Amino acid sequence: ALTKVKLLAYQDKRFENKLGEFELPINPEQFSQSFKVEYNREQAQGSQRNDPEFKFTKPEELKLDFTFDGTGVVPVNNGKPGEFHQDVADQVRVFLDLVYSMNSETHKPNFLRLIWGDFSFGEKNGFDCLLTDLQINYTLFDQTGKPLRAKLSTTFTSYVEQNRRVREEGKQSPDVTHQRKVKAGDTLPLMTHRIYGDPAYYLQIAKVNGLINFRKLATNTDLRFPPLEKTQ
Amino acid sequence: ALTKVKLLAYQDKRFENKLGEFELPINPEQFSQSFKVEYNREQAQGSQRNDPEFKFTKPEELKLDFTFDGTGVVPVNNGKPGEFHQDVADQVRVFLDLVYSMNSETHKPNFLRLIWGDFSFGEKNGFDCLLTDLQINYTLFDQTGKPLRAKLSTTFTSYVEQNRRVREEGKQSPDVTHQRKVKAGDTLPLMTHRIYGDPAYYLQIAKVNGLINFRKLATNTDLRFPPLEKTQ
Amino acid sequence: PEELKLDFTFDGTGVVPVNNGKPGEFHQDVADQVRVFLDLVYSMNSETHKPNFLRLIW
Amino acid sequence: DDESNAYLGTGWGFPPTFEKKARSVRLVSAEDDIRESLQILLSTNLGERVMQPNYGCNLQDLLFESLSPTVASNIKELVRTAILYYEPRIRLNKLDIQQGIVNEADAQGLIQIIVDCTIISTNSRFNFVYPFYLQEGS
Amino acid sequence: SSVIKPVLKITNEQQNNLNVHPTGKSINAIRAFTGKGTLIWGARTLAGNDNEWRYVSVRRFFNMAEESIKKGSEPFVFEPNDANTWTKVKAMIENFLTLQWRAGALAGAKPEQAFYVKIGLNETMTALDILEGRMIVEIGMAVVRPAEFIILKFSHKMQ
Amino acid sequence: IRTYPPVSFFFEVVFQGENLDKDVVETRFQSVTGLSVDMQTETLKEGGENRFEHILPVRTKYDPLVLKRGLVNDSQMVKWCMDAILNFDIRPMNLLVRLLHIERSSSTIAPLMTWKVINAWPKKWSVSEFNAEQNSIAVESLELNYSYFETLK
């Protein structure tokens, strides 16, 4: 069985209320995806090389090209004998209504999800996006004026909500509580350095856990490491 | 029967007072159409990815190329035997007078509509536009100086009136009144959420419809959902 | 600072041998490689809040 | 009183009917008030209303012609524009136009146009029904 | 569409005895769900315990395929009963079944795992059938089935 | 175990189509060719491995099918082709190509090899030169496109 690319159209920014779906009659031959990171590149005067600082990660980009053909030589994947694709205008109409026009209840275009069977973009099985660019070329016409072939080129950009973005960045810092078990070879200042980046806090940790002698630890003790105070 | 492309010239911005029409002697081989949407792309600090906001949709663009030929080998589609096209200057003259020159009563060029038989651009059968770019190349001449072949390239932009634009955007919002029928499985807070985006309004809705007990609804009741107050 | 440019390929149709010494073995899984690569070099680290530092060796 | 579909309005029927035993004039409502609306809009030419030169639809300008593609597209443009400007209460789905088939000589002379519409479940800012439009706006 | 509700409300304890029963005479329920509406909930025939004809969709698929192959076969009646016709009939049936495989109605990663077709002397026919004017073809097909139940299981790793 | 190879001049073509499979003149051809398939690949070089490069599969290509006959003045097949060519109206068909032999167990004519050719439609049509000074036959030639071919195993 041959699987086809599908575009799902949603109204909710949490992608829960599905409005519709469109299926491509011919799969694309290829597509491309683009990534980028942004750093600070200021340098001191009279210095050899540099160590740039991180600023942010930009949204990903997606490029796709495909074709509609209605001259009667491309079969329809429905199992009936003698069937071929013969209507371009209907497909252009439903496509433009689904991905391009304004929604009368939200006053903007719909949210899109791109899915191709078992394809994986990464840690997910779909691409959540919005349409930014589209071009159509009509290259073959009927004697009454109706088209027989159309070629489309599209550019999509990545979209993800605030609430969900801050949860994907599961920021772990000295802003949370840690717990560690003591094993053979462990010492308190080294554990403190490995959690806080500074051994100097060791005397505080011993007080939080009630340690009388902190230079000889037992090997089944579970130690708690509290967060740091918000402003010093 | 072979159908030909037609350009209709109007004086009214509502496209009611037709001034004239021009018919192409040779249909173009192809043409192209272009679309675009505009979003806000500002990003927070040290954040991974983003969720862009919608700004607006831009007018569509149309590109066309065609040819006039007068050497006597292209037949005229009028049914007479022995007839071929032999006059380029007359066609250039009527074309330029119809689509380019200033109108003496409006002080600007005319409004155009492009039609090709049964072709459909979308939800409509024509393209309403204005001319923005034109180039002509003369490549063959007679011994007296009169031309025998001309090639033309044109660029058009989309045009639509204010009154009509706001009606095409049939904005539905909590600015209007809604009506809903109660069916099996419905509850009042969920209906209120599905209309307003917030269940908290349910106690108001029950008062508008005179509901004594609003935790057990009947299944043929029609409920009214008023708009919200303009400023809070 | 110096700049470095690199291009390479993942292929999983079963004609490129695997360099492990077993007879009859060829590369046949692209998605797994893309996944581990992107997780190692691209995604944000949950403890430092930025991508990792890299060292290239041949 | 607040009934169902009150926001769609009630009005005079077309054509006007007067009853004498019941000393009243006939009034329609809801979906009948919409259908009759259409019958008016497509039977009036553009210059026939006294101070409303833009109300109407010039269909009779296409009589005495064969149904070529360039005629069908013109009919469709005229009808769509008229309905867009003067029928805010409905949504138009499609237009079907056919010539031919009764005697196959009488059938040749007539044109048939089918209008498919649905009724929107919300109100509209361009609907002059009282007293909602005093607050719903323009 | 155009439904207010079902006149009866059917519960889990009651549906338990409707689609599985010692007699096999299953009855298909129509039920309402919160936030969803009124749905059809069950797809079994009156032979609901049968290993082959348990489901509506398998029975209807077999009806469709048999009728289409019959209509495809009809142009070969009144021809000579020899190998030059058997090859044509075989080719026609195999082409139809390949089209059915591409659409996803038949299971298998390759066409050879989805169906088989056979026709020939001392395989499907004897000398007597050939002399009497009979022609016999054997066909086998693997059809996909629907799922009624979903089972969740959780596992845990220590780290 | 085989000792002698088969002969090439005893063959047949069948059109599984509109109603052409029962027309006798539609099976008689002077020549049939074009039954070949090719795999197209690309070359990739790996740094450090100087003994060989990698050949990677890309796509599959097929040759057109070519038929030659003496000219038949009234042919349903040619009507099908000219309907495709003049009115831009195509309707693809299926074909069988058979290589025949004599089997006996008295003797009978039977197929030896069979290929199925899927979704064929017209590509080219031609007729040979007319020359006042040569002894020749009017010969027409047809070329067809198709999707693929398979062995009727």
- What is the full DSSP assignment across B130-167? EEEEEEEEEEEE-TTS-EEEEEEEEEEEE---HHHHHH
- Cβ-based interface (< 8 Å): residues of C facing B: 44, 49-50
| Residues in chain A within 8 Å Cβ distance of E96 | 81
CA distance D123 to D127: 8
Please name the residue that has the structure tokens 């051809």: F29
Interface of D with B in 89-118 (CB under 8 A): none
Task: Provide the shortest C-alpha distance from residue C14 to chain F (in Å).
Answer: 9
Question: Which DSSP letter does residue E8 get?
Answer: S
Residue F152 contacts E, CB cutoff 8 Å? yes
- Is the Cβ–Cβ distance between B11 and B19 less than 8 Å? yes
CA dihedral B167, B169, B172, B178 (to 10 degrees): 40
Distances from the Cα of F25 to the Cα of E76, F22, F72, angstroms: 19, 9, 9
| Cis bond upstream, residue D15 (ω within 30) | yes
Long-range contacts of A190-199 (CB under 8 A, 24+ apart): A191/A223, A192/A225, A195/A225, A196/A225, A196/A228
Mutate to test the interface with E, among B180, B181, B182, B183 (most CBs of E within 10 A): B183
CB contact under 8 A, C11 and F57: no
**Radius of gyration over alpha carbons of chain A, in Å?**
29
- Cβ-based interface (< 8 Å): residues of B facing E: 183-185, 187, 190, 219-220
- Is the Cβ–Cβ distance between C46 and A170 less than 8 Å? yes
CA distance F83 to F19: 16
3-state secondary structure chain A: CCCCCEEEEECCCCCCCEEEEEECCCCCCCEEEECCEEEECCCCCCCCCCCCEEEEECCCEEEEEEEEECCCCCECCCCCCCCECCCHHHHHHHHHHHHCCCCCCCCCCCEEEEECCCCCCCCCCCEEEEEEEEEEEEEEECCCCCEEEEEEEEEEEECCCHHHHHHHCCCCCCCCCEEEECCCCCCHHHHHHHHHCCHHHHHHHHHHHCCCCCCCCCCCCEEEECCCCCCC
- Across A150-179, b (16+ Cβ under 10 Å) vs e yields bbbebebbbbbeeeeeeeeeeeeebeeeee
Minimum-distance CB partner of E4 among B187, B190, B220? B220
Length of chain B counted residue by residue: 232
CA distance A213 to A219: 14
CA closest to B48 among chain C residues? C44
| Residues in chain F within 8 Å Cβ distance of C27 | none
- Is the Cβ–Cβ distance between A144 and B5 less than 8 Å? no
Q: DSSP letters along C19-32, please?
A: TTS-TT-B---HHH
Supply E87's token pair: 């090859």
Beta strands A37-40; A53-57: pairing state: antiparallel
The residues that bridge with D10 in the sheet, in sequence order, are: D29
3-state secondary structure chain D: CCCCCHHHCEEECCCCCEECCCCEECEEEHHHHHHHHHHHHCCCCCCCCCCCCCCCCCCHHHCCCCCCHHHHHHHHHHHHHHHHHHCCCEEEEEEEEEECCCCCCCHHHCEEEEEEEEECCCCCCCCCCCCCHHHHCC
Please name the residue that has the structure tokens 């698929």: E61
Residue A71 contacts F, CB cutoff 8 Å? yes
Q: DSSP letters along B38-95, please?
A: EEE----TT-BS--PEEEEEPPPEEEEEEEEE-SS-SBPTTS-TT-B---HHHHHHHH
Mutate to test the interface with E, among F19, F116, F118, F119 (most CBs of E within 10 A): F116
CA closest to E93 among chain F residues? F152
| Residues in chain C within 8 Å Cβ distance of A123 | 35, 39
Supply A136's token pair: 């159509």
| Residues in chain A within 8 Å Cβ distance of C2 | 49
Which 3 state secondary structure label does DSSP give E138? strand
CB contact under 8 A, C51 and A50: no
- Is the Cβ–Cβ distance between C9 and F44 less than 8 Å? yes
Beta strands D10-12; D27-29: pairing state: antiparallel
Residue E144 contacts A, CB cutoff 8 Å? no
Task: Provide the shortest C-alpha distance from residue E97 to chain F (in Å).
Answer: 14
> Counting beta carbons within 10 angstroms of the beta carbon of residue C31, is it exposed (0 to 12), middle (13 to 18) or buried (19 or more)?
middle
- Is the Cβ–Cβ distance between E48 and E54 less than 8 Å? yes
DSSP E strands in chain E: the ranges are 29-33, 37-41, 115-118, 138-141
CA distance E95 to F62: 19
Supply B171's token pair: 């904005």
Supply B161's token pair: 């009136």
Supply F147's token pair: 């999707």
- Cβ-based interface (< 8 Å): residues of E facing F: 75, 82-84, 87-88, 90-92, 94-95
Minimum-distance CB partner of B35 among A59, A60, A100? A100
Planar angle of CA E103, E109, E115, nearest 5 degrees? 70
CB contact under 8 A, E4 and B183: yes
Q: What is the resolution of this structure in A?
A: 3.2
CA distance B206 to B188: 8
Q: Please provide the distance, in angstroms rounded to a whole number, between the alpha carbons at the two ends of chain F.
A: 20
| Cis bond upstream, residue D131 (ω within 30) | yes
| Residues in chain B within 8 Å Cβ distance of C44 | 48
Q: DSSP letters along E18-34, please?
A: TSS-TT-----EEEEET
Element (H, E) at B31: strand B31-40
| Residues in chain F within 8 Å Cβ distance of E101 | none
Element (H, E) at B129: strand B127-141
Residue E100: other Cβ atoms inside 10 A: 23
| Centroid of chain to Cα C39 | 10
Task: Provide the shortest C-alpha distance from residue F73 to chain E (in Å).
Answer: 27
- Please indicate whether chains A and F are in contact, defined as at least 3 beta carbon pairs under 8 Å: yes
Q: Phi and psi of A225, rounded to 5°?
A: -120, 100
Task: Provide the shortest C-alpha distance from residue E76 to chain A (in Å).
Answer: 18
Minimum-distance CB partner of B52 among A89, A143, A159? A159
| Residues in chain D within 8 Å Cβ distance of B165 | none
Residue E65 contacts A, CB cutoff 8 Å? no
CA closest to C44 among chain B residues? B48
- Is the Cβ–Cβ distance between A92 and A151 less than 8 Å? no
CA distance F98 to F102: 13
> Counting beta carbons within 10 angstroms of the beta carbon of residue E56, is it exposed (0 to 12), middle (13 to 18) or buried (19 or more)?
middle
The experimental technique behind this entry is: cryo-EM
Task: Provide the shortest C-alpha distance from residue C41 to chain B (in Å).
Answer: 14
Which 3 state secondary structure label does DSSP give E74? helix
Which 3 state secondary structure label does DSSP give C41? helix
CA distance F99 to F114: 6
CB contact under 8 A, B183 and E6: no
Question: Which DSSP letter does residue E83 get?
Answer: H
> Counting beta carbons within 10 angstroms of the beta carbon of residue A102, is it exposed (0 to 12), middle (13 to 18) or buried (19 or more)?
middle
Which residues neighbour A217 within 8 Å (Cβ) at sequence distance 6 or greater? A182, A186, A187, A188, A211
CA distance D98 to F30: 52
Which one, of F3, F32, F37, F2, lies nearest residue F15 by Cα? F32
CA closest to E93 among chain A residues? A81
CA distance E56 to A211: 72
The residues that bridge with F97 in the sheet, in sequence order, are: F13, F115
Mutate to test the interface with A, among F85, F88, F148 (most CBs of A within 10 A): F88
- Is the Cβ–Cβ distance between B184 and E37 less than 8 Å? yes
> Counting beta carbons within 10 angstroms of the beta carbon of residue B116, is it exposed (0 to 12), middle (13 to 18) or buried (19 or more)?
buried
Please name the residue that has the structure tokens 């430092």: C48
Task: Provide the shortest C-alpha distance from residue A229 to chain F (in Å).
Answer: 54
Which 3 state secondary structure label does DSSP give E70? helix
CB contact under 8 A, E103 and A77: yes
Minimum-distance CB partner of A1 among E68, E95, E102? E102
CB contact under 8 A, C9 and F57: no
| Centroid of chain to Cα D57 | 10
| Residues in chain A within 8 Å Cβ distance of B48 | 56-57, 165, 168-169
- Is the Cβ–Cβ distance between B131 and B153 less than 8 Å? no
Distances from the Cα of E83 to the Cα of B152, D133, E88, F110, F111, angstroms: 65, 82, 9, 7, 8
CA distance B194 to B214: 17
Q: Please provide the distance, in angstroms rounded to a whole number, between the alpha carbons at the two ends of chain E.
A: 52
| Residues in chain E within 8 Å Cβ distance of F96 | 87-88, 91
CA distance B225 to B208: 8
- Across E114-147, b (16+ Cβ under 10 Å) vs e yields bbebebeeeeebeeeeeeeeebebeeebebeeee
| Residues in chain A within 8 Å Cβ distance of E103 | 1, 77-79
Q: Phi and psi of E70, rounded to 5°?
A: -60, -45
Size of interface A-F (CB pairs under 8 A): 11
CB contact under 8 A, D46 and B16: yes
Question: Which DSSP letter does residue E143 get?
Answer: B
CA closest to F52 among chain C residues? C16
3-state secondary structure chain F: CCCCCCCCCCEEEEEECCCHHHCHHHCCCCEEECCCEEEEEEEECCCCCCCCCEEEEEEEEECCEEEEEECCCCCHHHHHHHHHHHCCCCCCEEEEEEEEEEEECCEEEEEEEEEEEEEEEEEEEEECCCCCCCCCCCEEEEEEECCEEEECC
CB contact under 8 A, A161 and B54: no
Distances from the Cα of A99 to the Cα of A50, A63, B159, F137, angstroms: 46, 15, 22, 62
| Centroid of chain to Cα C40 | 8
Minimum-distance CB partner of A122 among C2, C38, C50? C38
Distances from the Cα of A67 to the Cα of A24, A91, B56, F76, angstroms: 9, 11, 28, 34
Question: Which DSSP letter does residue C58 get?
Answer: -
Minimum-distance CB partner of B37 among A97, A131, A137? A131
Residue B117 contacts D, CB cutoff 8 Å? yes
- The conformational region for residue A145 under phi > 0 = left, psi -120 to 50 = alpha, else beta, is left
Distances from the Cα of E148 to the Cα of A207, B3, B102, D84, F20, angstroms: 59, 56, 72, 48, 49
- Please indicate whether chains D and C are in contact, defined as at least 3 beta carbon pairs under 8 Å: no
Question: Which DSSP letter does residue C51 get?
Answer: P
